[PDB]
Amino acid sequence: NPFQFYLTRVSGVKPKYNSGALHIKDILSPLFGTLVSSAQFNYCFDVDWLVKQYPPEFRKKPILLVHGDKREAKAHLHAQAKPYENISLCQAKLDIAFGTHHTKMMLLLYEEGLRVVIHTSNLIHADWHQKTQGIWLSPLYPRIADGTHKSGESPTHFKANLISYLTAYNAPSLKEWIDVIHKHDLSETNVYLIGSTPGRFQGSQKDNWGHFRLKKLLKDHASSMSWPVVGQFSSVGSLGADESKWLCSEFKESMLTLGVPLYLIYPSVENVRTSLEGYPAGGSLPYSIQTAEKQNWLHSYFHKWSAETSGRSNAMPHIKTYMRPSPDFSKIAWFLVTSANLSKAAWGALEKNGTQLMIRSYELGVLFLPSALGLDSFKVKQKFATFPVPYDLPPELYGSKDRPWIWNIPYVKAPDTHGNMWVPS
Amino acid sequence: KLNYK
Incomplete structure (x- = not known):
């Protein structure tokens, strides 16, 4: 399967229509890798729900929330997050009026390599329940041999392109994710x-x-x-x-x-x-x-x-x-x-x-x-x-x-x- | 933000 394009699981249809479908719990499962850290880019978050979608053994690993909330909504999200010591937040500058941080992406760093997930769902229960949503899963990107000189780049320029995307935020916490990506081989990206x-x-x-x-x-x-x-x-x-x-x-x-x-x-x-x-x-x-x-x-x-x-x-x-x-x-x-x-x-x-x-x-x-x-x-x-x-x-x-x-x-x-x-x- | 509403 060259596409790695998936739909989210839908509750209340016949199990055959969910056979090739993914729930967020599936994406975050230990079968996809051994989680060390993750970044969650989104528009809407239910922090309590989100944390529960991680497998128990990973719930204490660092998580970064990349959101665009301001004023009281920002305070609200910070209040949602405070109970969880392992969670940091990154507020994407929205300098132009009526803009949103609408991107839905997961960066998943494992012991075995790195995964990028680009999708359409908010991180709230209802978005993953009975909606048609889409998911693209990158391959497991291996770490670049600490002895080798290579770009880890793909013919589609994904790796450079992803870095440029993260760079435009001008955000300290993303710089570390940019550095993580530099160290991985994204050449199999199509x-x-x-x-x-x-x-x-x-x-x-x-x-x-x-x-x-x-x-x-x-x-x-x-x-x-x-x-x-x-x-x-x-x-x-x-x-x-x-x-x-x-x-x-x-x-x-x-x-x-x-x-x-x-x-x-x-x-x-x-x-x-x-x-x-x-x-x-x-x-x-x-x-x-x-x-x-x-x-x-x-x-x-x-x-x-x-x-x-x-x-x-x-x-x-x-x-x-x-x-x-x-x-x-x-x-x-x-x-x-x-x-x-x-x-x-x-x-x-x-x-x-x-x-x-x-x-x-x-x-x-x-x-x-x-x-x-x-x-x-x-x-x-x-x-x-x-x-x-x-x-x-x-x-x-x-x-x-x-x-x-x-x-x-x-x-x-x-x-x-x-x-x-x-x-x- | 918990929703659009």
Whole structure:
């Protein structure tokens, strides 16, 4: 299995749909290595829950929490963490307004080597319970022989790329993780790292982050050959008064680069209503009426969540993915799993007459390119050489009576799976 | 932060 792309375990589906799935307890288990230390990058944390996901024999090993909380929320997290002597925190500078530390990544240092896990889930119980989430697991990276001169770098430049990502934080506690990574051999890595970092980027530095980074990788490591673009996410930013402001202009342009129908997959109210969680699934789909009313145009691009292939049509997506299928959806030119939702905050927006790229947030994803496996395309695995697309193709358009899930208006005409209504406030 | 809410 060259991909090492996994779904999280979902409670309440048949065990066969969980056979190739991972729970966080599985990822942290002693079978994956003998843990010495770890770093947990995320947006939301439940520290008490998190500590319990480690095996008992590892709960006292040092853990670093990399978060973006400020003011009282920062105090709250510190208060959550204090009982646990082995836990330190690193506050990622968020100098630009409305930015978040959204990256989900684990750095796992073992006696036997090092592991990097890039995924989509918050560190809270609900994100790992009945949601569709994605996980990429690096291989066990061995330590570089203390007698040898080697870079430990991969053809995809992952190791240098990961270090640059950590370096942009300018944080003392991450420097030690940068040093740990220097000492390991990441040469077997076959994915490309796509990061976002807060800032305003000029000149050559545009290509470093966000959708311009993606464009650059697609230009350099893909080749050309009516191939649609698919985008799938759980949050939706303010995209502008119409499709030309950003979505189809800069965003789609990066996405269609190689060496055009746009499908956006976002849960409808019906999708959420009849989910395993019911309406409270909508608590993790934060599309607000204030945003939605400004951009009604966007919703004609919307398609329903359907994942019969993985038995997860009722497990609401918190995974975010982007890809480039052929016109019949039997193959793909590339696949990206990432923390980045559909927003300028996460992907970047061009400022100052197109000379500046502005990103508000930390985001991180892995890109699977057929060239990194020596192929020209991946065949799509129809039932979850062939890439495991976790949801159904082609995507199904919203019916005439469907609306996108909007989290801050009430739904009281029909009960959900558990016989409840939804009245936020 | 324990959630979006």
